[PDB]
Amino acid sequence: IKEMPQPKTFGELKNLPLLNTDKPVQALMKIADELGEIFKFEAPGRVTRYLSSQRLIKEACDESRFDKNLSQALKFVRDFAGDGLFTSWTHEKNWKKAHNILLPSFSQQAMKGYHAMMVDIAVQLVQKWERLNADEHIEVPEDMTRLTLDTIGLCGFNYRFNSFYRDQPHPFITSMVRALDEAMNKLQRANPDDPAYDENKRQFQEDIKVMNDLVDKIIADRKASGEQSDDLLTHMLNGKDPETGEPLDDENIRYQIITFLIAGHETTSGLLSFALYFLVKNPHVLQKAAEEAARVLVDPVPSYKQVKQLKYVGMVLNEALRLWPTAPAFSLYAKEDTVLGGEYPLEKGDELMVLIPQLHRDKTIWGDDVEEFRPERFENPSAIPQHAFKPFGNGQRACIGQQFALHEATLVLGMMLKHFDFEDHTNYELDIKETLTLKPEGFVVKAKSKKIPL
Amino acid sequence: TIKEMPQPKTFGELKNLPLLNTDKPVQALMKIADELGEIFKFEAPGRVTRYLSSQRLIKEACDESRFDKNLSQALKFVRDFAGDGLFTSWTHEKNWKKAHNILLPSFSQQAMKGYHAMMVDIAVQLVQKWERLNADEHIEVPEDMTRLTLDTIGLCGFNYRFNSFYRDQPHPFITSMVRALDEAMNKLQRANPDDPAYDENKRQFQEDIKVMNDLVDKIIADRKASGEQSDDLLTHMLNGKDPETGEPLDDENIRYQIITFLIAGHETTSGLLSFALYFLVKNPHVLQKAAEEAARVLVDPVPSYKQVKQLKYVGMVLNEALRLWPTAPAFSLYAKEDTVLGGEYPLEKGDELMVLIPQLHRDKTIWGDDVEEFRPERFENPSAIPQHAFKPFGNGQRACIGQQFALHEATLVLGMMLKHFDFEDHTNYELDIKETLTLKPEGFVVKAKSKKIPL
Numbered sequence A: 001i002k003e004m005p006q007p008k009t010f011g012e013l014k015n016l017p018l019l020n021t022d023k024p025v026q027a028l029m030k031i032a033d034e035l036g037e038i039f040k041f042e043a044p045g046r047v048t049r050y051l052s053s054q055r056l057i058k059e060a061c062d063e064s065r066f067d068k069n070l071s072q073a074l075k076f077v078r079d080f081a082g083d084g085l086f087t088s089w090t091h092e093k094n095w096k097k098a099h100n101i102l103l104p105s106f107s108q109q110a111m112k113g114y115h116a117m118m119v120d121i122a123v124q125l126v127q128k129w130e131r132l133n134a135d136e137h138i139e140v141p142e143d144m145t146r147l148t149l150d151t152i153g154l155c156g157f158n159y160r161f162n163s164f165y166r167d168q169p170h171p172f173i174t175s176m177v178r179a180l181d182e183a184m185n186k187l188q189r190a191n192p193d194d195p196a197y198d199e200n201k202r203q204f205q206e207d208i209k210v211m212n213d214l215v216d217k218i219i220a221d222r223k224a225s226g227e228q229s230d231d232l233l234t235h236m237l238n239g240k241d242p243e244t245g246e247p248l249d250d251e252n253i254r255y256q257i258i259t260f261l262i263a264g265h266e267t268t269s270g271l272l273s274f275a276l277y278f279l280v281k282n283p284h285v286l287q288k289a290a291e292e293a294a295r296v297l298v299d300p301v302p303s304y305k306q307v308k309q310l311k312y313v314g315m316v317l318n319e320a321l322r323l324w325p326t327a328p329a330f331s332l333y334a335k336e337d338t339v340l341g342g343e344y345p346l347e348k349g350d351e352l353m354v355l356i357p358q359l360h361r362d363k364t365i366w367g368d369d370v371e372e373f374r375p376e377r378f379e380n381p382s383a384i385p386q387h388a389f390k391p392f393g394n395g396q397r398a399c400i401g402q403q404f405a406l407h408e409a410t411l412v413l414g415m416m417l418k419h420f421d422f423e424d425h426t427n428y429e430l431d432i433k434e435t436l437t438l439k440p441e442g443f444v445v446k447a448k449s450k451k452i453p454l
Numbered sequence B: 001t002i003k004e005m006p007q008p009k010t011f012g013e014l015k016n017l018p019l020l021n022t023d024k025p026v027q028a029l030m031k032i033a034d035e036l037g038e039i040f041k042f043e044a045p046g047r048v049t050r051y052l053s054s055q056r057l058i059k060e061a062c063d064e065s066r067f068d069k070n071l072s073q074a075l076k077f078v079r080d081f082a083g084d085g086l087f088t089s090w091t092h093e094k095n096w097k098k099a100h101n102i103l104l105p106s107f108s109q110q111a112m113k114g115y116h117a118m119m120v121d122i123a124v125q126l127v128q129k130w131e132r133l134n135a136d137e138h139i140e141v142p143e144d145m146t147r148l149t150l151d152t153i154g155l156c157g158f159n160y161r162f163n164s165f166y167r168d169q170p171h172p173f174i175t176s177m178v179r180a181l182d183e184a185m186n187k188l189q190r191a192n193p194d195d196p197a198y199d200e201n202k203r204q205f206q207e208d209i210k211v212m213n214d215l216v217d218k219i220i221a222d223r224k225a226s227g228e229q230s231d232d233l234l235t236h237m238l239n240g241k242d243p244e245t246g247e248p249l250d251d252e253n254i255r256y257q258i259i260t261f262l263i264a265g266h267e268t269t270s271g272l273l274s275f276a277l278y279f280l281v282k283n284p285h286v287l288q289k290a291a292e293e294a295a296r297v298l299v300d301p302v303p304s305y306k307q308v309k310q311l312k313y314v315g316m317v318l319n320e321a322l323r324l325w326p327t328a329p330a331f332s333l334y335a336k337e338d339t340v341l342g343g344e345y346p347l348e349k350g351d352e353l354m355v356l357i358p359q360l361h362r363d364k365t366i367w368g369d370d371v372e373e374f375r376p377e378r379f380e381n382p383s384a385i386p387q388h389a390f391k392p393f394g395n396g397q398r399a400c401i402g403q404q405f406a407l408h409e410a411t412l413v414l415g416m417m418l419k420h421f422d423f424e425d426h427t428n429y430e431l432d433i434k435e436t437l438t439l440k441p442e443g444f445v446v447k448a449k450s451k452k453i454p455l
């Protein structure tokens, strides 16, 4: 039985001021490097234990001993995401109901149905970049957000955000991003009631109204038209939980649409932005990926089967998720009194945080070269030990969108690498913006067309 | 027989100048023409011009033995950034005939076949934009038509993509161009242009000119350095030799031609397409006849050059839209010698005339009492039209060089719109005409219902 280390304290505020930074996850990664596989993090009224080793995280991922916790971050996100899939407790009736109704919409098989709509948005991205003039550059995260938001809008709800027809952000996306940012900002407030935050709270309620108004209109419009689109909204309006036999109520459907739009856009746009970052910084890897895209994507429009043949592109995406998993932590609570790793006694209800980027740098799993971008680590996926690679979380509370995201990102990155050569014309210095999700900020490139027609 | 011509209301020392203190000066001059008739004197401090509205007088003004193109006060202000380009040059300037001879073959059928592919590129972007609207959404007609015609001339002019359909706010170059045009038209009403109140306007104007020159001169220098040959006007202008002088255009004149063409595409063809769609949704029998022609002729996903030339009724629709709202609403002439207009109005050498095209096109002695009705069938027998009765492209050797270009673009685009969509005047839109250099509907919105025909 060992005492776990704890980072520097600030008297009565304990560790809370360590979160007073626009990059809290990167701060916690540096703390993990200094303190090791486990450390105590205390704020007034809460304790959590940050885990960084596969040795301890494999135990935390035992669903008989630990269940998903709503971290302080998710409790704040629940103010707009309600009891949607992401911000519901496993024991809430609406978690299992929504999970059972929506799971078949998100299988590898279901991806065949979404494919044509993913291509629609991917072709818009390629056409945008083909139409740039000499000496113009690409704003990578901005264009990846346009792509991932439009893809989930169209595939999920048959709704066109038409993000590529706008050079200033969609009003809905302004509110979504600011709502997420307010959730992260609430984490570091020593005094949440300080009048300095009154404007932030008024803006938060305005942003919630913007999101609700659009979503509730989409639900009402679909109900009024009677249209069957075989999209997520169709499945949610018509679907019945096999267990309870109940449908979702209109309120829960609204929270699911908000949840899908936010998670769908934020995480996947981060992945594509990090993937392109690593490719232009590792030109040997860019060349391997570009050769595969050129050899496999022989048709103007990729087919579903051709996307499944982009093996190296898939390894590139997994290696980007290893280094910068875009939803970089998940929280667990102990179901009963238990001992973690034969050394750390826990009481029923005790919180754990899995620090995914640190897990993914565990030298006992990956070897000494853990900072290197080497997609070949994933060439034999079976070689990866249990619970060593967790970019989609764990068990029944794992990402429902995993197949969706990886199909979209593989298709899009394949088309990008088929159609363009890329130049890191600014020698971009990685700047990772945190809004609970991670994405490169200020990342620009030049694309030179290979002049291959669509 | 010699008559004194009427004159609208005066403002003491300012004479008629305050009549132009409006954002709708052409519409103001049309109402003056309705009241005073075929000719009126318009005086400002230090200038006089005579506004003509009847075919009887305009047919005389179009006599090239007696009258030549004049730079109206408007064109003199535009010449600060359009220089001695084709539009703002005098007929007798060496660079007018030289540029005219070099550029005429850039509007040959062979050149038009090359421009067609680039027009289709932009037209498909417009159709895709409208196909991608959600059910609750409307089209901003003049906004989308301007996006289309600017992008078309940018691609056809110098192989440059404004990417107007990727933007809510204009390209920085277009912000400067539009503000430069606005400054030119605003200078028309200024009693004292030297008032220090206008120092800011003048500073902004010089900044806007630098923005336009810097972009255009860079594109010309880049093209010369690369040696790349495209299907664009810039290639024709870098390679062309005037058969008369044997000289090519110099890089400065090429820049003025590019600015001239970009202003033309942004301003004129977008107006025509917006007015044409206005008249179609207000006249559903005409919309149906045009849509039946589009459906019969445009049988391929991408229209061909030859298919567009078969859209005869769509062409009549565009001519009838130009009759009622000619988007370039005036041209100016000066007397080459002392002469008498219409056997009644003595003119001295140098005297200025303004042709008020929208009034000409409402001459009931030519068109009949149904003159306000939208009837494309008026253009079934064009030989019936008296001399100089229909002048939307101006007159003689100074007539629009882009006439074929603009009518091909507008026919292609209107044809594709009518093939792909049904239109609804969902607001019962009341025509409101915004004036810049040109006339365009303002606030015109419609809903499109897709006929779901693939591209």
Ligand SMILES: CCCCCCCCCCCC(=O)N[C@H]1CCOC1=O
Pocket (backbone or CB within 6 Å): A019, A024, A025, A071, A073, A074, A077, A081, A086, A184, A187, A258, A259, A260, A262, A263, A266, A327, A328, A329, A330, A436, A437
């Ligand atoms: C509507 C669904 C929400 C979609 C995005 C949610 C991503 C949540 C990841 C939360 C990770 C997380 O808890 N981060 C905390 C830990 C302390 O500092 C932080 O920032």
Ligand SMILES: CCCCCCCCCCCC(=O)N[C@H]1CCOC1=O
Pocket (backbone or CB within 6 Å): B025, B026, B072, B073, B074, B075, B078, B082, B087, B188, B260, B263, B264, B267, B268, B327, B328, B329, B330, B331, B437, B438
């Ligand atoms: C370089 C310009 C290219 C194409 C522009 C064509 C439009 C030119 C028309 C100029 C009309 C014009 O001179 N209008 C005056 C008449 C009195 O008040 C006005 O507004």
